[PDB]
């Protein structure tokens, strides 16, 4: 997101605005205002690694922008928007991730490595890789009888089509010692 | 199938610099997804 302080009516601020957005969900609901439009309208731009070197990013658009004049004891503890030079803002951090990690629920609550594990195993799992398996003659392939979409979810999943082609089941799990088996 | 389509190979030599997760990697490559041992960090995912 480009944040250029072009706000003659306030501080520095994101190019894109609630209008741009409802104007997009407009087209979402029609299934004219593409991604390419957000781009040509210089609201969002592609910055590589090299060019990243010379800019300053705001994690959350909100949080890291309006001024400051209590805090939730349960939530985590965020640093701050101590800056004004903000040239860009991250669409959402959840995007540093990759398809793999993107299906891991609450990965912001796991010991780092544990995330790299499930990141490899999900590729050892079973489900429904395509809906036309009935017609494919691939050597070896497994389809899970009754796949249930997960109860826990990720806004990322939505684009990975996970809910339409899951890879597991919601099992009623009890954590306890029993027989000892 | 998706994840394989976004896979990166980074040929080796004979260290640990390339195997490690760099800062510039933020936003570009995944911080958690990489093969264990062997070619760890040598194979990355966008």
């Amino acid at each position: 997101f480009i944040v250029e302080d072009d706000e003659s009516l306030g501080h520095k601020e994101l190019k894109v605005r609630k209008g741009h957005i409802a104007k997009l969900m407009a087209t979402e609901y029609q299934d004219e205002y593409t991604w390419s439009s957000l781009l040509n309208e210089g609201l969002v731009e592609y910055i590589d690694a090299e060019e990243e070197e010379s800019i300053l990013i705001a994690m959350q658009p909100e949080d890291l922008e309006p001024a400051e004049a209590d805090v939730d004891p349960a939530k985590r503890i965020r640093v701050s928007h101590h800056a004004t030079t903000f040239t860009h803002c991250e669409i959402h951090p959840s995007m540093i991730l990759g398809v793999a990690a993107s299906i891991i629920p609450f990965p912001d609550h796991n010991q780092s490595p544990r995330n790299t594990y499930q990141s490899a195993m999900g590729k050892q799992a079973m489900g429904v890789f395509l809906t036309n398996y009935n017609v494919r003659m691939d050597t070896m392939a497994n389809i899970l009888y009754y796949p249930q979409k997960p109860l826990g979810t990720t806004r990322a999943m939505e684009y990975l089509k996970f809910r339409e082609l899951p890879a597991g089941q919601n099992a009623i799990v009890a954590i306890a010692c029993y027989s000892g088996y | 199938t998706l994840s394989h389509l976004r896979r990166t190979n980074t040929p080796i030599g004979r260290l640990a610099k390339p195997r490690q997760l760099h800062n510039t990697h933020w936003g570009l490559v995944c911080p958690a997804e990489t093969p264990e041992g062997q070619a760890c960090g040598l194979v990355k995912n966008l």
Partner: peptide
């Protein structure tokens, strides 16, 4: 007020737009 700010939730709508056009495998294609 087609010119007000934008909170968290909003960003998603943009992200949706992204994939609508590019697609998870874009790179390999282009």
């Amino acid at each position: 007020d087609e010119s007000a700010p934008i909170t968290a939730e909003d960003s998603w709508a943009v992200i949706s737009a992204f994939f609508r056009e590019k697609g998870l495998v874009s790179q390999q294609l282009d």
